[PDB]
Scaffold this active site. Structure first.
Site, PDB file in Angstrom:
ATOM      1  N   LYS A   1       0.604  -1.225  -0.213  1.00 41.45           N
ATOM      2  CA  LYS A   1      -0.104   0.079   0.138  1.00 41.45           C
ATOM      3  C   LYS A   1       0.758   1.185  -0.014  1.00 41.45           C
ATOM      4  O   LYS A   1       2.064   1.127   0.052  1.00 41.45           O
ATOM      5  CB  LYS A   1      -1.028  -0.050   1.224  1.00 41.45           C
ATOM      6  CG  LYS A   1      -0.139  -0.188   2.542  1.00 41.45           C
ATOM      7  CD  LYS A   1      -1.134  -0.504   3.760  1.00 41.45           C
ATOM      8  CE  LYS A   1      -0.488  -0.260   5.101  1.00 41.45           C
ATOM      9  NZ  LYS A   1      -0.009   1.040   5.401  1.00 41.45           N
TER      10      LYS A   1
ATOM     11  N   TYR B   1      17.219  30.170   3.412  1.00 43.66           N
ATOM     12  CA  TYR B   1      15.910  31.033   3.941  1.00 43.66           C
ATOM     13  C   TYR B   1      16.170  31.100   5.515  1.00 43.66           C
ATOM     14  O   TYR B   1      16.466  30.400   6.066  1.00 43.66           O
ATOM     15  CB  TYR B   1      14.518  30.520   3.686  1.00 43.66           C
ATOM     16  CG  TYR B   1      14.172  30.365   2.330  1.00 43.66           C
ATOM     17  CD1 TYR B   1      14.044  31.338   1.578  1.00 43.66           C
ATOM     18  CD2 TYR B   1      13.951  29.250   1.563  1.00 43.66           C
ATOM     19  CE1 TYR B   1      13.809  31.509   0.098  1.00 43.66           C
ATOM     20  CE2 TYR B   1      13.823  28.978   0.316  1.00 43.66           C
ATOM     21  CZ  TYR B   1      13.717  30.143  -0.487  1.00 43.66           C
ATOM     22  OH  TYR B   1      13.340  30.222  -1.787  1.00 43.66           O
TER      23      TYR B   1
HETATM   24  C1  LIG Z   1      13.670  31.807  -7.906  1.00 41.43           C
HETATM   25  C2  LIG Z   1      12.293  31.612  -7.131  1.00 41.43           C
HETATM   26  N1  LIG Z   1      11.178  32.404  -7.450  1.00 41.43           N
HETATM   27  C3  LIG Z   1      10.240  32.322  -6.735  1.00 41.43           C
HETATM   28  C4  LIG Z   1       9.884  31.610  -5.799  1.00 41.43           C
HETATM   29  C5  LIG Z   1       8.419  31.620  -5.317  1.00 41.43           C
HETATM   30  O1  LIG Z   1       8.445  31.847  -4.095  1.00 41.43           O
HETATM   31  P1  LIG Z   1       7.387  31.902  -3.219  1.00 41.43           P
HETATM   32  O2  LIG Z   1       6.420  30.936  -3.323  1.00 41.43           O
HETATM   33  O3  LIG Z   1       7.790  32.516  -2.160  1.00 41.43           O
HETATM   34  O4  LIG Z   1       6.967  32.802  -3.945  1.00 41.43           O
HETATM   35  C6  LIG Z   1      10.890  30.600  -5.429  1.00 41.43           C
HETATM   36  C7  LIG Z   1      10.496  29.674  -4.104  1.00 41.43           C
HETATM   37  N2  LIG Z   1      11.018  28.665  -4.203  1.00 41.43           N
HETATM   38  C8  LIG Z   1      10.906  28.286  -2.817  1.00 41.43           C
HETATM   39  C9  LIG Z   1       9.790  27.320  -2.369  1.00 41.43           C
HETATM   40  O5  LIG Z   1      10.192  26.988  -1.345  1.00 41.43           O
HETATM   41  N3  LIG Z   1      11.791  26.526  -1.367  1.00 41.43           N
HETATM   42  C10 LIG Z   1      11.908  27.294  -2.552  1.00 41.43           C
HETATM   43  O6  LIG Z   1      13.170  27.400  -3.083  1.00 41.43           O
HETATM   44  C11 LIG Z   1      12.093  30.648  -6.143  1.00 41.43           C
HETATM   45  O7  LIG Z   1      13.173  29.947  -5.745  1.00 41.43           O
HETATM   46  C1  LIG Z   2      -3.056  -4.021   8.861  1.00 41.21           C
HETATM   47  C2  LIG Z   2      -1.740  -3.852   8.619  1.00 41.21           C
HETATM   48  N1  LIG Z   2      -0.973  -5.082   8.116  1.00 41.21           N
HETATM   49  C3  LIG Z   2       0.344  -4.885   8.029  1.00 41.21           C
HETATM   50  C4  LIG Z   2       0.829  -3.597   8.087  1.00 41.21           C
HETATM   51  C5  LIG Z   2       2.601  -3.502   7.872  1.00 41.21           C
HETATM   52  O1  LIG Z   2       3.123  -3.075   8.719  1.00 41.21           O
HETATM   53  P1  LIG Z   2       4.384  -2.747   8.906  1.00 41.21           P
HETATM   54  O2  LIG Z   2       4.738  -1.489   8.175  1.00 41.21           O
HETATM   55  O3  LIG Z   2       4.801  -2.089  10.135  1.00 41.21           O
HETATM   56  O4  LIG Z   2       5.160  -3.979   8.722  1.00 41.21           O
HETATM   57  C6  LIG Z   2       0.035  -2.331   8.293  1.00 41.21           C
HETATM   58  C7  LIG Z   2       0.692  -1.006   8.609  1.00 41.21           C
HETATM   59  N2  LIG Z   2      -0.010   0.224   8.071  1.00 41.21           N
HETATM   60  C8  LIG Z   2       0.666   1.093   8.936  1.00 41.21           C
HETATM   61  C9  LIG Z   2       1.997   1.660   8.191  1.00 41.21           C
HETATM   62  O5  LIG Z   2       1.962   3.054   8.686  1.00 41.21           O
HETATM   63  N3  LIG Z   2       0.588   3.521   9.042  1.00 41.21           N
HETATM   64  C10 LIG Z   2       0.062   2.223   9.378  1.00 41.21           C
HETATM   65  O6  LIG Z   2      -1.299   2.440   9.867  1.00 41.21           O
HETATM   66  C11 LIG Z   2      -1.140  -2.799   8.475  1.00 41.21           C
HETATM   67  O7  LIG Z   2      -2.140  -1.543   9.090  1.00 41.21           O
END
Ligand SMILES: Cc1ncc(COP(=O)(O)O)c(CN[C@H]2CONC2=O)c1O
Ligand SMILES: Cc1ncc(COP(=O)(O)O)c(CN[C@H]2CONC2=O)c1O
Lengths: 359, 359
Positions: free
Chosen positions: A34, A255
């Site tokens: 899953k 940032y």
């Molecule tokens: C070059 C550039 N222009 C515009 C934006 C737009 O930014 P906002 O969503 O703030 O406007 C980003 C953000 N890139 C961000 C997203 O978060 N991490 C980054 O590098 C950017 O790297």
């Molecule tokens: C019913 C059932 N069987 C098997 C597994 C597999 O578990 P392991 O991943 O731990 O082996 C999960 C995990 N489902 C988990 C995974 O994360 N969140 C959940 O609810 C489960 O819900």
């Protein structure tokens, strides 16, 4: 060059399935695939593992993609079905289903199907998420036994809430409740997943459901890795440097100017960010491998880029290989450094990474 | 179907682009749609905004998907190109590119293209991520000016590291550096993204690059929302209950038994988890809307399910509508409650969520 790429090792995957049969030699396997196979690819993980006794999914949708891709092996709907109108499908697709509420049971009782459906009655033994509670279980169970649409015998399934905490008696209590209800009943029994398989041999029963450990990743937060149990890591999150720049002492990076350099150095920019699935919560100091050697993340992880400190005379160049986690860097190590669960790390990745399968 | 679904409001999206033109009335718009349009869908976000002057992406791959989907409008490669062999494509696709390192410049100098490429020289004005540093900028700029393969004039681009922190003088310093380099130079100027647009009218110049705010989400961590600036939220993360169960006082819920009920109540199980993109870091108490009313998350968020407390006589049934964030629940509010940046919340979602577009 090459950007955000998830490399899946098919040999490790097969090895883990066989390794797990060695740990639970008298139990059949439900390969839990899953959530896009925990980030490794739903259909490809299934194609890789034709030896599995069945495949487990969260949702009906996932089960249908398996059939659509050519998977023929039994698929277990761990959460059952959400709509009574889906029973004809489930019957015809030969999907096994959990049954945890009145809606599903009543649905099965009055539907008219061309074929009965194998069922796994989900018992709530202590986790209190899904399943019939103890006081209602007996009456509920008996109705499923009287269903013409339910293949007999009805099987019994449950799940642990704290199998990774051997010191508290939670798991033993769930087993006590599980065992009491199964007494005198025919039909397969299943309660153990990764943690139950590894730490509780008394919970193996007829079928075990390996999930996290199937991918070579530990279900415990005690800094153990998949290799602690003889399981090989399947996934590698990789990328490349897109820039190597000069940087001065006292100058901040990223940032919020979150990190300041105490020396003239060279910084590397990785084509990786949370827009790919890498945790924004990763603190400065978190390890990443550039040309096979460990370097620290410096400054905030951004949407598409991550900066690392290479050293003043580094020699690394844009285009060089970067490993976010993989060979030489277990995802559990990342989990520990970032305080993000390994389950989420490998699973909450976006559609922007390329998927690649090897050997 | 009616499980993890991201609903995108196309009307809100168009409204925000026009609203931003009102805030920066003398600047052209680069609609930043990288990282699958911040989780809203790369191609669909572009299709609903034909009025944009250009589209901005992180990677070349994203730009090509836009062309592949029929987008003909100019696409700006914010990080430039990673391989010199990609210049012939960039030239033929009419992609505008940033140029921040020697590799890219030398590549332009010696490539042979059937048509020149419009370039945006990236200047490092203080964030120290990508870009040519001040002392190397003049010589670097002059070479681009002498390129037969570079369409003249060369434009100038930079980015803020702390535009959301008006207190500190970081933004003013980047401006100072930006202005000094641009003096006497022709060619378009661009340094502002969401924060610069909203809080710094002196940074609008010729082109502004709205990202986060374009989607109706605030770029600030001061509890402000997109509506504080007249921008409407575009995304709604929705799902359904798959179970409503009885629960007793003193009984724990979820992995690690981390939440214990102090009263007999009814719990709801939502078809949503981090396997869909919902933050595992969400603490008990985080709000979610079930049938339009706010209820708290109880216990750890799992891969595919989330439990909420409905109340002892709550009338809610499996199949009922659930809102993780959207109408009546801003993603900024969930950002605050979980301490996860809104940028990551809307962006780090998996492919398991279904995409739906409305008017
Ligand atoms: C070059 C550039 N222009 C515009 C934006 C737009 O930014 P906002 O969503 O703030 O406007 C980003 C953000 N890139 C961000 C997203 O978060 N991490 C980054 O590098 C950017 O790297
Ligand atoms: C019913 C059932 N069987 C098997 C597994 C597999 O578990 P392991 O991943 O731990 O082996 C999960 C995990 N489902 C988990 C995974 O994360 N969140 C959940 O609810 C489960 O819900």
């Amino acid at each position: 060059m090459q950007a955000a790429t998830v490399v899946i090792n098919r040999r490790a995957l097969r090895h883990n399935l066989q390794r797990l049969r060695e740990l639970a030699p008298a139990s059949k396997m439900v390969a839990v695939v899953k959530a896009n196979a925990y980030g490794h690819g739903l259909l490809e993980t299934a194609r890789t593992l034709p030896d599995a006794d069945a495949f487990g999914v969260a949702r009906l949708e996932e089960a249908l993609r398996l059939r659509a891709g050519g998977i023929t092996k039994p698929v277990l709907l761990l959460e059952g079905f959400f709509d009574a109108r889906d029973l004809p499908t489930i019957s015809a697709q030969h999907f096994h289903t959990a049954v945890h509420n009145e809606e599903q049971l009543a649905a099965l009782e009055e539907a008219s199907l061309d074929e009965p459906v194998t069922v796994w009655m989900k018992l709530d033994t202590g986790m209190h998420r899904l399943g019939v509670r103890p006081e209602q279980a007996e009456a509920f169970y008996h109705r499923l036994t009287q269903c013409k649409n339910v293949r007999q015998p009805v099987n019994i399934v449950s799940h642990f809430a704290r199998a990774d905490e051997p010191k508290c008696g939670a798991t033993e209590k769930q087993l006590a409740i599980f065992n009491t209800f199964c007494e005198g009943k025919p039909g397969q029994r299943s309660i153990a997943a990764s943690g139950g398989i590894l730490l509780w041999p008394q919970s193996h029963f007829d079928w075990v459901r390996p999930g996290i450990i199937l991918y070579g990743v530990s279900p415990l937060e005690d800094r153990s890795t998949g290799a602690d149990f003889g399981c090989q890591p399947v996934m590698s999150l990789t990328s490349s440097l897109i820039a190597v720049r000069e940087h001065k002492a006292g100058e901040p990076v990223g940032y919020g100017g979150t990190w300041v350099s105490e020396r003239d150095t060279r910084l590397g920019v990785v084509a990786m960010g949370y827009g790919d699935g890498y945790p924004r919560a990763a603190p400065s100091g978190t390890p990443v491998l550039v040309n096979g050697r460990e370097v620290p993340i410096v400054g905030r992880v951004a949407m598409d880029m991550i900066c690392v400190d290479l050293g003043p005379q580094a020699q690394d160049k844009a285009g060089d290989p970067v490993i976010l986690w993989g060979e030489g860097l277990p995802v559990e190590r990342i989990a520990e450094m970032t305080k993000v669960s390994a389950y989420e790390l490998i699973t909450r990745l976006t559609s922007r990474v390329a998927m690649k399968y090897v050997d």
